Amino acid sequence: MLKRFPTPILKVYWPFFVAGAAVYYGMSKAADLSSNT
Amino acid sequence: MQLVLAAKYIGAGISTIGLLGAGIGIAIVFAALINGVSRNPSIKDTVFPMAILGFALSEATGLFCLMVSFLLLF
Amino acid sequence: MQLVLAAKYIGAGISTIGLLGAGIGIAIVFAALINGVSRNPSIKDTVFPMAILGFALSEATGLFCLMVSFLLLFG
Amino acid sequence: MQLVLAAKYIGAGISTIGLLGAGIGIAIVFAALINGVSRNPSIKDTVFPMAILGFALSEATGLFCLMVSFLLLF
Amino acid sequence: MQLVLAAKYIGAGISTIGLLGAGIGIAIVFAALINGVSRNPSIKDTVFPMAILGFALSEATGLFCLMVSFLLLF
Amino acid sequence: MQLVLAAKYIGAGISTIGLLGAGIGIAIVFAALINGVSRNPSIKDTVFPMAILGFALSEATGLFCLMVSFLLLF
Amino acid sequence: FYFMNQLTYGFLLMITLLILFSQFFLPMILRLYVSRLFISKL
Amino acid sequence: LTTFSLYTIIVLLVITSLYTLTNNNNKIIGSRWLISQEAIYDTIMNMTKGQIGGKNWGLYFPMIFTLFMFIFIANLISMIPYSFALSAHLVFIISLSIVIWLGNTILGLYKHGWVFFSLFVPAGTPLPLVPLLVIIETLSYFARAISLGLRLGSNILAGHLLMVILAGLTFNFMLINLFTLVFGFVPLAMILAIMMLEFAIGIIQGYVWAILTASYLKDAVYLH
Amino acid sequence: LQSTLDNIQSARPFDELTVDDLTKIKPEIDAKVEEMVKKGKWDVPGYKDRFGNLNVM
Amino acid sequence: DESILLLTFLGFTGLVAKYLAPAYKDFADARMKKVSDVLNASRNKHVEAVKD
Amino acid sequence: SAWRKAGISYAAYLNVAAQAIRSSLKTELQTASVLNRSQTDAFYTQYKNGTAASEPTPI
Amino acid sequence: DPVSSLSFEPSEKPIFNAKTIEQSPSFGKFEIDTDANVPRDLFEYTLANQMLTAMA
Amino acid sequence: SSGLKLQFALPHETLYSGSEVTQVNLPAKSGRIGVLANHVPTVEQLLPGVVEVMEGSNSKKFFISGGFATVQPDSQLCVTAIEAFPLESFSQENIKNLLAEAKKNVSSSDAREAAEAAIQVEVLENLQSVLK
């Protein structure tokens, strides 16, 4: 199919993943504070 | 309903002044036409069909604007 | 209801002059076109499709103007 | 209450003409594009995205008005 | 009270078109950009860093009035 | 009675678009920066503080305008 | 309404395409680059 | 089940349908379906090679690839008339911009820390506007954040709904009296021009997204 | 080298050769590809000269 | 109401098959012949180098 | 001023400029190369298609 | 053209009129004012310099 | 280049020829133009005035009788002109003014003489700024 290569996405792309989790937590705050509109 | 025809009248009033930039743009067209023929008299009426064509379709914007004002009167 | 369609008509009135920059815009494009052939005669057929590119998308913005004046006139 | 929907309509109308500032702006980009190539024919592909990129930055500003109209329309 | 939100609707309408000249202005920076490299090809990736800086600052003029439309929307 | 705060909203609407001129203004403070420094590439460090001088104290006047809006909103 | 829905499935498919295009679709063409270069350079 | 997540599944099926069926048995010659992907890879490669210009420039080159392609593909499916809006969910696209901006700030603070706050002073200026130049910077610092998202979906949401309501134009023009069929060819060409605009407002706006966040990558990675 | 010339004579699939056959004939290809990914020199130097980038810009 | 945008889509794709398809056809054919010609010529060149 | 219409060519414009500059000389510094540099001694004679003659005038 | 002190050459030098100067392909590369008659004077300057070089 | 190659050339003595220079300052058709180490390839006709050449060393002050400044695109600026000039020694007021009055008199003659004498009055009055 396609030759899988261990291309660096964990030792390079950590802070955007951290930001995605933090925005999920902010959406937890928002959908528990401003989803009852 | 005494207000609505008068509002159509003032709407045709505010929808009239779109020809301001139409006249400005066609003046800039003829201004660059003079400035182009001043530096190129040799090519005068090859640019000028293209110049007057762009003039035509570009003033047609303000023409459509005041005929919108015409149909808004009616 | 004795006031709403009248305000719709004057809202179509104020949304008619935003194509002002149509009547400037494409035209001053042509102005540089007249410059472009003047200082460079053999570039004309080079630039005029690009300039007609510089025509078409350049005027359609003003189209948006009167289609607001087409909608609030009718609906 | 019979005015607030009319206020939405005329507030949409005064919000509309911001695309004017697009419709002039993009033009001089194209005009500069002609003066990107009239004085320099060998560089135009260099500016062939780079001009129209600026188009997409100016056009969107006009696109940031009428939909500000539309949320007041709807 | 049916009138105050009507007035803030039309206040969002008038606070829309402040993008206008900014929607011009970014373009005129781009206009100079097309006259930057077609004049000077070997400054192409020197000015284009700061010019797209000067883009965003010219955005920073004509964007916040836009969100004055949105906060007066709510 | 219902107009004393409704009119503050429309005053905030009209009293914000002054950045419009800033959207025209500082643009050429970049744009004449471009065709200036494209004309002379090594004037850049000579002029880029001066330009960012001539940016800032020419911008903040427009930043006063919506400030007059802000106190008129609160 | 569907803020959690769109946001969560968008997060999943964003990180999915991140790792997917990274491990697969850029080096599958970089192989073509290095192959054509190594044949042309011999 | 949601039609939106199903649309994302259709996106991933097209992603399968861009390279596997493209590549005839791993051939050197580069067939016609692969030439377009070659051109895309090169026009992103040579772009971000000159954009961020780093010694470590390629290290985010896949990211600047894959943040583009999502907007490149999702504005090829809503182009269908009988479709629902994919990227016109402004909460989603603006939240994507929030994620990218916050990842840039965490990258800049993990790479530089306190000297990452040295970005607030662009040039040496005389005294009575030294802090003010910071403030308009900070005023632009979230405007660096907010606009790029609030400038993509508001494009697309302005487009197709246009082609909804102007379809209503053809529901308001070709339903009045029969002489509306006379010279009624110009709304057809007008909607044709709007579709010409819509391919632009997808593709070129996705490239605008890519180039602006590439500039923001040079901002966050390199302190001036 | 006469056998090398005869090998070049009848074994040139210059329109149908596989890049997996190139990785099979040369694992140095795979090594340079993987190292080129892992270091992050995503530029391919000395390619654009004879093999143009054929992109939009 | 929605099939009229479909009619514009069908007419536009007909214009695409009229206009855009032979241009991209010729671009792909030109790049195909160019890459194939260079890839054959480099091989023939170092075959001649082997002969030298 | 209007030398382009009425007076000189631009080469001759700069020639008259050089004659004025070397005419504004320091007489200590006005060497023989200066005066020989202004030693206008060329004689022009307009011929015709029948090789006729004009005056050999001092240019 | 004195090729040496002991040799020589009768040599030709072309002069391009100012009409050709705006028509030149590698000419818009050089920035020039349209409003200063720079080709129509630089052609005269070219004529003067090439005459002086030919004579000397 | 770091700096610039100045080719300052005259019919009697080409003074600088690719001399490495930081700044040239020259009266051209658009006025006094200062050009640094880099510039657009640009052709300018030069009005007779004061050229100030600043280098790694100080800035020299010469007078020029007009000519051409041409930026060869390798950042080689060629000044091609006629007259060089010292600080102020070649300039003498009694030489200039007594001739300038006679040149105003010859500017009343026929237009072949009058235009040229008007040019000469212009040049001597520009040289009055060199008298300074």
Curated annotation (Swiss-Prot), chain C:
Keywords: CF(0), Formylation, Hydrogen ion transport, Ion transport, Lipid-binding, Membrane, Mitochondrion, Transmembrane, Transmembrane helix, Transport. The gene is OLI1. Mitochondrial membrane ATP synthase (F(1)F(0) ATP synthase or Complex V) produces ATP from ADP in the presence of a proton gradient across the membrane which is generated by electron transport complexes of the respiratory chain. F-type ATPases consist of two structural domains, F(1) - containing the extramembraneous catalytic core and F(0) - containing the membrane proton channel, linked together by a central stalk and a peripheral stalk. During catalysis, ATP synthesis in the catalytic domain of F(1) is coupled via a rotary mechanism of the central stalk subunits to proton translocation. InterPro entries: ATP_synth_F0_csu, ATP_synth_F0_csu_DDCD_BS, ATP_synth_F0_csu_sf, ATPase_proteolipid_c-like_dom, F/V-ATP_Csub_sf. F-type ATPases have 2 components, CF(1) - the catalytic core - and CF(0) - the membrane proton channel. In yeast, the dimeric form of ATP synthase consists of 17 polypeptides: alpha, beta, gamma, delta, epsilon, 4 (B), 5 (OSCP), 6 (A), 8, 9 (C), d, E (Tim11), f, g, h, i/j and k. Its main location: mitochondrion. Belongs to the ATPase C chain family. It is found in: Mitochondrion membrane. The chain crosses the membrane at residues 14-34, 52-72. It is a multi-pass membrane protein. The record marks 59 as: Reversibly protonated during proton transport.
Swiss-Prot record, chain G:
One of its GO terms (biological process) is proton motive force-driven ATP synthesis. Keywords: ATP synthesis, CF(0), Hydrogen ion transport, Ion transport, Membrane, Mitochondrion, Transmembrane, Transmembrane helix, Transport. The keyword Membrane applies. The chain crosses the membrane at residues 7-26. Mitochondrial membrane ATP synthase (F(1)F(0) ATP synthase or Complex V) produces ATP from ADP in the presence of a proton gradient across the membrane which is generated by electron transport complexes of the respiratory chain. F-type ATPases consist of two structural domains, F(1) - containing the extramembraneous catalytic core and F(0) - containing the membrane proton channel, linked together by a central stalk and a peripheral stalk. During catalysis, ATP synthesis in the catalytic domain of F(1) is coupled via a rotary mechanism of the central stalk subunits to proton translocation. It is a single-pass membrane protein. F-type ATPases have 2 components, CF(1) - the catalytic core - and CF(0) - the membrane proton channel. In yeast, the dimeric form of ATP synthase consists of 17 polypeptides: alpha, beta, gamma, delta, epsilon, 4 (B), 5 (OSCP), 6 (A), 8, 9 (C), d, E (Tim11), f, g, h, i/j and k. It comes from the Eukaryota. It comes from Saccharomyces cerevisiae (strain ATCC 204508 / S288c) (Baker's yeast). This is ATP synthase protein 8. Belongs to the ATPase protein 8 family. It is found in: Mitochondrion membrane. The keyword Ion transport applies. Disulfide bonds: none annotated.
Curated annotation (Swiss-Prot), chain J:
The keyword Chaperone does not apply. Disulfide bonds: none annotated. This is ATP synthase subunit 4, mitochondrial. GO terms for cellular component: mitochondrial inner membrane; mitochondrion; proton-transporting ATP synthase complex. Mitochondrial membrane ATP synthase (F(1)F(0) ATP synthase or Complex V) produces ATP from ADP in the presence of a proton gradient across the membrane which is generated by electron transport complexes of the respiratory chain. F-type ATPases consist of two structural domains, F(1) - containing the extramembraneous catalytic core, and F(0) - containing the membrane proton channel, linked together by a central stalk and a peripheral stalk. During catalysis, ATP synthesis in the catalytic domain of F(1) is coupled via a rotary mechanism of the central stalk subunits to proton translocation. Keywords: CF(0), Hydrogen ion transport, Ion transport, Membrane, Mitochondrion, Mitochondrion inner membrane, Phosphoprotein, Transit peptide, Transport. It comes from the Eukaryota. It comes from Saccharomyces cerevisiae (strain ATCC 204508 / S288c) (Baker's yeast). Its main location: mitochondrion. F-type ATPases have 2 components, CF(1) - the catalytic core - and CF(0) - the membrane proton channel. In yeast, the dimeric form of ATP synthase consists of 17 polypeptides: alpha, beta, gamma, delta, epsilon, 4 (B), 5 (OSCP), 6 (A), 8, 9 (C), d, E (Tim11), f, g, h, i/j and k.
Curated annotation (Swiss-Prot), chain K:
Its main location: mitochondrion. Pfam families: ATP-synt_Eps. GO terms for cellular component: mitochondrial inner membrane; mitochondrion; proton-transporting ATP synthase complex. It comes from the Eukaryota. The keyword Mitochondrion applies. It is found in: Mitochondrion; Mitochondrion inner membrane. InterPro entries: ATP_synth_F1_esu_mt (IPR006721), ATP_synth_F1_esu_sf_mt (IPR036742). One of its GO terms (molecular function) is proton-transporting ATP synthase activity, rotational mechanism. Keywords: ATP synthesis, CF(1), Hydrogen ion transport, Ion transport, Membrane, Mitochondrion, Mitochondrion inner membrane, Phosphoprotein, Transport. GO terms for biological process: proton motive force-driven ATP synthesis; proton motive force-driven mitochondrial ATP synthesis. The modification Phosphothreonine is found at residue 51. SUPFAM superfamilies: Epsilon subunit of mitochondrial F1F0-ATP synthase (SSF48690). Coiled coil: none annotated. F-type ATPases have 2 components, CF(1) - the catalytic core - and CF(0) - the membrane proton channel. CF(1) has five subunits: alpha(3), beta(3), gamma(1), delta(1), epsilon(1). CF(0) has three main subunits: a, b and c. Belongs to the eukaryotic ATPase epsilon family. Present with 4280 molecules/cell in log phase SD medium. This is ATP synthase subunit epsilon, mitochondrial. The gene is ATP15.
